[PDB]
């Protein structure tokens, strides 16, 4: 039948999770942002649409730092972005607290990955 | 409730016309055993604050971690983290004072005595003390443990009241502190000859000096002292 796209963790007959796909739409409707890996680092950049002359220039920063060595930028629902970075920050602090060394990027990525994957389970 | 194991002795400090000075030896004692000698007990936070800690060393290391986190956190979503919204010495102290009092109120204290020295953004000198009981206070000079008994009297001969601050130079002030460190090495059985000293000047900024040593000590007169009363040789 139908209705497989009304609840978040439901597999449709073809094995898809429509709610996740609809989330993607929210992302494609968002501002463009990128990242470029260089020979000894990474660069992040993003587009900030100027809705009007009223927006104070340079003020509404979008790129966010996690710990002191990680940069994060995202496209889609901004509040969801901040939410994910807050988690990332806790995840990073917890890692450093136990292991002393600041969190490796691969390790940090799976932390964000597992958390986001978790929001497709219920 | 606990009991200190590895400990650091005195932390002495004072303020002069353009800033504040703070020093502490590099020893980590284990009871009567002078166990560790490369211990840094002066914690710089940013470039306007230095936190000197005495008492339990494991708790000091814990406070160190708390301080690093403050810096990291303050930088989060803060485009002015290195300017108008950088950590002020007074913020750092209020934070520690809050933690110290909360911990004593849960009957599980951080067994330390702390002095926060620094210069506020408006140039004002900042010197305040907080200990394991959550008790706090300010004075032109501040010292913990043994230094409270022997350093304060000396440093107060330089700055005996507020009005003496503007009349005191970095040279005079640093001299007092260095002399006090030597006195403490003479009478404090848990002190070390090696120490660190830091200056926070509203003009020259933060100057952190490591590996200093007590010099110019008088011991020669010891040869003249024999016996404990009637003995002649």
UniProtKB/Swiss-Prot annotation, chain A:
Report the record's Gene Ontology biological process terms.
proteasomal ubiquitin-independent protein catabolic process; proteasome-mediated ubiquitin-dependent protein catabolic process
Task: Please tell me whether the keyword Ribosomal protein is annotated for this protein.
Answer: no
Task: Give the principal location in a single coarse category.
Answer: cytoplasm
Per UniProt, the keywords (alphabetical) are: Acetylation, Cytoplasm, Nucleus, Proteasome
> What are the boundaries of the signal sequence?
none
Task: Provide the protein's localization.
Answer: Cytoplasm; Nucleus
Gene Ontology CC terms: nucleus; proteasome complex; proteasome core complex, alpha-subunit complex; proteasome storage granule
Explain the post-translational modification. Answer: The alpha and beta forms are probably products of the same gene with different post-translational modifications.
Q: Which GO terms describe its molecular function?
A: mRNA binding
Something else known: Present with 12000 molecules/cell in log phase SD medium.
The entry assigns this protein to a family as follows: Belongs to the peptidase T1A family.
Q: What does this gene product do?
A: The proteasome degrades poly-ubiquitinated proteins in the cytoplasm and in the nucleus. It is essential for the regulated turnover of proteins and for the removal of misfolded proteins. The proteasome is a multicatalytic proteinase complex that is characterized by its ability to cleave peptides with Arg, Phe, Tyr, Leu, and Glu adjacent to the leaving group at neutral or slightly basic pH. It has an ATP-dependent proteolytic activity.
Quaternary structure note: The 26S proteasome consists of a 20S proteasome core and two 19S regulatory subunits. The 20S proteasome core is composed of 28 subunits that are arranged in four stacked rings, resulting in a barrel-shaped structure. The two end rings are each formed by seven alpha subunits, and the two central rings are each formed by seven beta subunits. The catalytic chamber with the active sites is on the inside of the barrel.
State what protein this is by name: Probable proteasome subunit alpha type-7
Species of origin reads Saccharomyces cerevisiae (strain ATCC 204508 / S288c) (Baker's yeast)
Lineage of origin: Eukaryota, Fungi, Dikarya, Ascomycota, Saccharomycotina
Stretch of the intact protein here: 5 to 126 of 288
Swiss-Prot record, chain B:
* Domain of life where this protein originates: Eukaryota
**A single BP term in Gene Ontology:** proteasome assembly
Query: Is Nucleus there in the keyword field?
Result: yes
Determine if 4Fe-4S is one of this entry's keywords.
no
Instruction: Extract the InterPro entries matched here.
Output: Ntn_hydrolases_N (IPR029055), Proteasome_beta4 (IPR016295), Proteasome_bsu_CS (IPR016050), Proteasome_sua/b (IPR001353), Proteasome_suB-type (IPR023333)
Localization, per the record, is:
Cytoplasm; Nucleus
Question: What CDD domains does the record tag this protein with?
Answer: proteasome_beta_type_4
Per the record, its GO cellular-component terms are: cytosol; nucleus; proteasome complex; proteasome core complex, beta-subunit complex; proteasome storage granule
Q: Kindly report the protein's main subcellular placement as a broad class.
A: cytoplasm
This protein's UniProt keywords: Cytoplasm, Nucleus, Proteasome
Q: What does this protein do?
A: Non-catalytic component of the proteasome which degrades poly-ubiquitinated proteins in the cytoplasm and in the nucleus. It is essential for the regulated turnover of proteins and for the removal of misfolded proteins. The proteasome is a multicatalytic proteinase complex that is characterized by its ability to cleave peptides with Arg, Phe, Tyr, Leu, and Glu adjacent to the leaving group at neutral or slightly basic pH. It has an ATP-dependent proteolytic activity. PRE3 and PRE4 are necessary for the peptidyl-glutamyl-peptide-hydrolyzing activity.
Subunit field text: The 26S proteasome consists of a 20S proteasome core and two 19S regulatory subunits. The 20S proteasome core is composed of 28 subunits that are arranged in four stacked rings, resulting in a barrel-shaped structure. The two end rings are each formed by seven alpha subunits, and the two central rings are each formed by seven beta subunits. The catalytic chamber with the active sites is on the inside of the barrel. Interacts with CIC1.
* Additional facts recorded: Present with 16900 molecules/cell in log phase SD medium.
Q: Which family does it belong to?
A: Belongs to the peptidase T1B family.
The name this protein carries in UniProt is Proteasome subunit beta type-7
| Species this chain originates from | Saccharomyces cerevisiae (strain ATCC 204508 / S288c) (Baker's yeast)
């Amino acid at each position: 039948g139908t209705g497989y796209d009304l609840s978040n963790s439901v597999f449709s007959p073809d094995g898809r999770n429509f709610q996740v796909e609809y989330a993607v739409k929210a992302v494609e409707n968002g501002t463009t942002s990128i990242g470029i890996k260089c020979n000894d680092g990474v660069v992040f950049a993003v587009e900030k649409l100027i809705t009007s002359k009223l927006l104070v220039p340079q003020k509404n920063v979008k790129i966010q730092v996690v710990d002191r060595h990680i940069g994060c930028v995202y496209s889609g629902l901004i509040p969801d972005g901040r939410h994910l970075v807050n988690r990332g920050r806790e995840e990073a602090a917890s890692f450093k607290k136990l292991y002393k060394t600041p969190i490796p990027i691969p390790a940090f990525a799976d932390r964000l990955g597992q958390y986001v994957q978790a929001h497709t389970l219920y | 409730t606990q009991q200190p194991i590895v400990t650091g002795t005195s932390v002495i400090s004072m303020k002069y016309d353009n800033g504040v000075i703070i020093a502490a030896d590099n020893l980590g004692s284990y009871g009567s055993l002078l166990r560790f000698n490369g211990v840094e007990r002066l914690i710089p936070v940013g470039d306007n604050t230095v936190v000197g800690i005495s008492g339990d060393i494991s708790d000091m290391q814990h406070i160190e971690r708390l301080l690093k986190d403050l810096v990291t956190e303050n930088a989060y979503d803060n485009p002015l983290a290195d300017a108008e919204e950088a950590l002020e010495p007074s913020y750092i102290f209020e934070y520690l004072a809050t933690v110290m009092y909360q911990r004593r109120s849960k009957m599980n204290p951080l067994w330390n005595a702390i002095i926060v020295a620094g210069v506020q953004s408006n140039g004002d000198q900042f010197l305040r003390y907080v200990n394991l009981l959550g008790v706090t206070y300010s004075s032109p000079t501040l010292a913990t443990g043994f230094g409270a008994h022997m350093a304060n009297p000396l440093l107060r001969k330089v700055v005996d009241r507020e009005s003496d601050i503007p009349k005191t130079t970095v040279q005079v002030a640093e001299e007092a502190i260095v002399n006090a460190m030597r006195v403490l090495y003479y009478r404090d059985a848990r002190s070390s000859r090696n120490f660190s000293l830091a200056i926070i000047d509203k003009n020259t900024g933060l100057t952190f000096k490591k590996n200093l040593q007590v010099e110019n000590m008088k011991w020669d007169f010891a040869k003249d002292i024999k016996g404990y009363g009637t003995q002649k040789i």
